[PDB]
């Protein structure tokens, strides 16, 4: 990682946050902190969230999601490379009119993944919880894309790869950035 | 890595970016950031991308590719050593007239690699996706080299090693840098 300040810190001075890895708790804590720090420096100016991520933890993603919706500045989202799972959910969560992808970027949507081990009762609890998590994801995606919940449910049933143009048609982004 | 600043940071001050490893998400995020940073410092001066890479992730490579095409400065590409798979795709993605290789550099093209595990339906999705990725690569390579999509398809079917001179004849580069 070269120095100009490391490159990501230099970009953070221009209000650019990089979401460039699997989303786990450390990544979410860092992005949340960056979002809040930027809002404290200037509550009116846009923030730019660049996304190249396969997704990861849903709760970690929701920490990011809720922070984005909470703060006053608009958070633009820009998919470079790949936004899969929670990454695509976050891509869709940018300020309306300011969600972008580059032309060759890949967007993927699917249902949440998990696990449960133990007594019947424990498995039931885990199943209920993951089903409720899915309904919550789908509802939000519905509101953000303008698609019905039934269509979202069907279209996320298995891995669904969208082109940038397709993601725009779907309502996951507003514009394909053209060179 | 010796100190002059570490050597890569010193080269970045002269607008040289080193793509000297396997292409994964970290490498792509760094190169993207460097490209944008250089454009912000000066939107008219050329940038130089030095390539010695076996390739790697296709989506990571496309993050770099799209960033190259997006920015205003010309990005020269120089293959030193090896440009294989996505590395050769990126070599070919430099500004027309400014793609080079050193005389003993090795260029390799082939089809994308992957995997799929699971239900028949899951394997089908994975197969469709990797076939679509290949079509996208081939189409772009067609435009960048002047070769037909059909010729690219045939010539990438298996590992195809090109000399620097051959890469020039193919349209992957414009010149062999002679001593």
């Amino acid at each position: 990682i070269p120095t100009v300040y490391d490159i990501y810190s230099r970009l953070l001075k221009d209000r650019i946050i990089m979401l460039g890895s699997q989303i786990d708790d450390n990544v979410a804590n860092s992005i949340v902190s960056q979002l809040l720090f930027l809002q404290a420096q200037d509550s009116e100016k846009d923030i730019y969230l660049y996304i190249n991520s396969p997704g990861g933890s849903v709760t970690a993603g929701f920490a990011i999601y809720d922070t984005i919706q909470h703060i006053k500045p608009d958070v633009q989202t820009i998919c470079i490379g790949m936004a899969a799972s929670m990454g695509s959910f976050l891509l869709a969560a940018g300020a309306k009119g300011k969600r972008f992808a580059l032309p060759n970027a890949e967007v993927m949507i699917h249902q949440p993944l998990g696990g449960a081990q133990g007594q019947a009762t424990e498995i039931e609890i885990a199943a209920n919880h993951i089903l409720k998590t899915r309904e919550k994801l789908n509802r939000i995606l519905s509101e953000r894309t303008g698609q019905s919940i039934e269509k979202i449910q069907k279209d996320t049933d298995r891995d669904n790869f969208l082109t940038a143009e397709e993601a725009k048609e779907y309502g996951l982004i507003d514009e394909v950035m053209v060179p | 890595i010796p100190t002059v600043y570490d050597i890569y940071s010193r080269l970045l001050k002269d607008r040289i970016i080193m793509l000297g490893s396997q292409i994964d998400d970290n490498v792509a995020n760094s190169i993207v950031s460097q490209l944008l940073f250089l454009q912000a410092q000066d939107s008219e001066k050329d940038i130089y991308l030095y390539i010695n890479s076996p390739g790697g992730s296709v989506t990571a490579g496309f993050a770099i590719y799209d960033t190259i095409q997006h920015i205003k400065p010309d990005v020269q590409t120089i293959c030193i050593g090896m440009a294989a798979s996505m590395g050769s795709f990126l070599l070919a993605a430099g500004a027309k007239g400014k793609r080079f290789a050193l005389p003993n550099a090795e260029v390799m093209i082939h089809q994308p690699l992957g995997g799929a595990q699971g239900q028949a339906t899951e394997i089908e999705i994975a197969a469709n996706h990797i076939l679509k990725t290949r079509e996208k690569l081939n189409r772009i390579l067609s435009e960048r080299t002047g070769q037909s999509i059909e010729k690219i398809q045939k010539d990438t079917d298996r590992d195809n090693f090109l000399t620097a001179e051959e890469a020039k004849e193919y349209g992957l580069i414009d010149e062999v840098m002679v001593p």
Binding site: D14, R15, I16, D46, Y48, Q76, I78, K98, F100, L102, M177 | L36, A40, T67, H70
Partner: peptide
């Protein structure tokens, strides 16, 4: 990526 992000 400006314009406009930033």
């Amino acid at each position: 990526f400006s314009p406009x992000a930033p």
